[PDB]
Ligand binder design. Structure first.
Ligand SMILES: CCCCCCCC/C=C\CCCCCCCC(=O)O[C@H](COC(=O)CCCCCCCCCCCCCCC)COP(=O)(O)OC[C@@H](O)CO
Ligand SMILES: CCCCCCCC/C=C\CCCCCCCC(=O)O[C@H](COC(=O)CCCCCCCCCCCCCCC)COP(=O)(O)OC[C@@H](O)CO
Ligand SMILES: Cc1ncc(OC[C@@]2(c3cccc(F)c3)C[C@H]2C(=O)Nc2ccc(F)cn2)c(C)n1
Ligand SMILES: CCCCCCCCS[C@@H]1O[C@H](CO)[C@@H](O)[C@H](O)[C@H]1O
Ligand SMILES: CCCCCCCCS[C@@H]1O[C@H](CO)[C@@H](O)[C@H](O)[C@H]1O
Ligand SMILES: CCCCCCCCS[C@@H]1O[C@H](CO)[C@@H](O)[C@H](O)[C@H]1O
Ligand SMILES: CCCCCCCCS[C@@H]1O[C@H](CO)[C@@H](O)[C@H](O)[C@H]1O
Length: 300
């Protein structure tokens, strides 16, 4: 009887709390490291004028998209990942998924414009001029586009009541629309930008691997390839799971509901883990950012 008791103690009590601890610790750790890290990126560029480059201005914009997701959307995701219900009412059911989707769009477009800049600077020079004022113009353009293209996402979000509990999920009048929408969503936010980026960085790799500038360029190119690779890894589970669910009608079966919950939770958590990842990447793969981060830890 002793083995059976230890098995139910594990299933009914020890495993669920171990799960809750790991889930909350992981989300809190990501929240702190992403909030501290991304503010320090913004500070590193503001305090050091030599760091005020086109790439670094776009990296500040990537950190602000990261702060938008970490401040507003990360707590909301954590509680849905815990309760599997919506506790912020009808209004925030439209607002919060919209802001998180907008932040992904900004992140993707910011990276695209970085790749583009490096590709024209290194692979095809003298064709297009790239200045800091023009980087701000592109930065504003990225926000206007991300804010507009994510309105359809806000539109389908509905807070449904059916102890009575609300759920925040997409509402679809027909079976065809979610399939077309989530196919476009995935291609535009993930597959086409990263595919184009991987090909651009590979050309930059071929060109880079005037001597002093070529040494500087290789350091930044190595770092940005890591930022893109880490972004592609962090976003792959959520992108695939969304396509499998919305385009291939998977995970509708309730045989192992918790297995699906755990897969979607880890996938939601990884998106936020990305905001904590970037300042850590700039710390190890950038000596200039590291100096500012070391200065911040020594001062505070
Ligand atoms: C980066 C490269 C891309 C470059 C392209 C750049 C293009 C930039 C141009 C214009 C952007 C302007 C924003 C348009 C705003 C979107 C307008 C909008 O809100 O759509 C509603 C209808 O659609 C809906 O719900 C359901 C949406 C239907 C989607 C079906 C698929 C059509 C294909 C479309 C796929 C796009 C996916 C974009 C992914 C990022 C109508 O709302 P309504 O007023 O009634 O009040 C809300 C009420 O419906 C709440 O229930
Ligand atoms: C929406 C947001 C848009 C805004 C984002 C802006 C992004 C701006 C960034 C960088 C500038 C891009 C520079 C790209 C440089 C292109 C580099 C290049 O020439 O490499 C070719 C790869 O082509 C290829 O296969 C093509 C790759 C196909 C494989 C599919 C990968 C993912 C999809 C890829 C996306 C398609 C987008 C198309 C939009 C018009 C070599 O050819 P290959 O002789 O080996 O061929 C035969 C063999 O591959 C057949 O299997
Ligand atoms: C709990 C939770 N449910 C779904 C989630 O993401 C699902 C979505 C998405 C698809 C592909 C890549 C993404 F990066 C995000 C649809 C977007 C959203 O942004 N949805 C959204 C965001 C926050 C939120 F609280 C509720 N829904 C998340 C990230 N968290
Ligand atoms: C933070 C969210 C808390 C984690 C919840 C996931 C753990 C479920 S484990 C286990 O699943 C069995 C299904 O048969 C039930 O009988 C038990 O009661 C339960 O303990
Ligand atoms: C190519 C033209 C693109 C326009 C596509 C519009 C199709 C409407 S889908 C419809 O939108 C509603 C918004 O109120 C949701 O509530 C529904 O549940 C959803 O199914
Ligand atoms: C032909 S029926 C058609 O089957 C498709 C499967 O691809 C779906 O896209 C649609 O919902 C449905 O109308
Ligand atoms: C504009 C691009 C959008 C095209 C994608 C719509 C076609 C749906 S694929 C189809 O969907 C079913 C879901 O029920 C699955 O059963 C099938 O296995 C799968 O093959």
């Amino acid at each position: 009887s002793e083995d059976e008791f230890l098995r139910y103690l594990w299933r009914d009590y020890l495993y669920p709390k171990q799960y809750a601890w790991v889930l909350i610790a992981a989300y809190v750790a990501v929240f702190v490291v992403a909030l501290v890290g991304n503010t320090l990126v913004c500070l590193a560029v503001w305090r050091n004028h030599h760091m005020r480059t086109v790439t670094n201005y776009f990296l500040v914009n990537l950190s602000l998209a990261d702060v938008l997701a970490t401040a507003i959307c990360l707590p909301a995701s954590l509680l849905v990942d815990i309760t599997e219900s919506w506790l912020f009412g009808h209004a925030l059911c439209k607002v919060i998924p919209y802001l998180q989707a907008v932040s992904v769009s900004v992140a993707v477009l910011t990276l695209s414009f970085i790749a583009l800049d490096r590709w024209y600077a290194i692979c095809h020079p003298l064709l297009f001029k790239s200045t800091a004022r023009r980087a701000l113009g592109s930065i504003l353009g990225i926000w206007a586009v991300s804010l507009a293209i994510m309105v359809p996402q806000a539109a389908v979000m509905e807070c449904s009541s059916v102890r009575a509990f609300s759920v925040c999920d997409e509402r679809w009048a027909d079976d065809l629309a979610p399939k077309i929408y989530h196919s476009c969503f995935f291609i535009v936010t993930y597959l086409a930008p990263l595919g184009l980026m991987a090909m651009a960085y590979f050309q930059i790799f071929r060109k880079l691997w005037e001597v002093k500038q070529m040494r500087a360029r290789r350091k930044t190119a190595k770092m940005l390839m890591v930022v893109v690779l880490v972004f592609a890894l962090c976003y792959l589970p959520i992108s695939v799971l969304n396509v499998l669910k919305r385009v291939f009608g998977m995970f509708r079966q309730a045989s192992d509901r918790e297995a699906v919950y755990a897969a979607f939770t880890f996938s939601h958590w990884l998106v936020y883990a990305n905001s904590a990842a970037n300042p850590i990447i700039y710390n190890f793969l950038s000596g200039k950012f590291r100096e500012q981060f070391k200065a911040a830890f020594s001062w505070w």
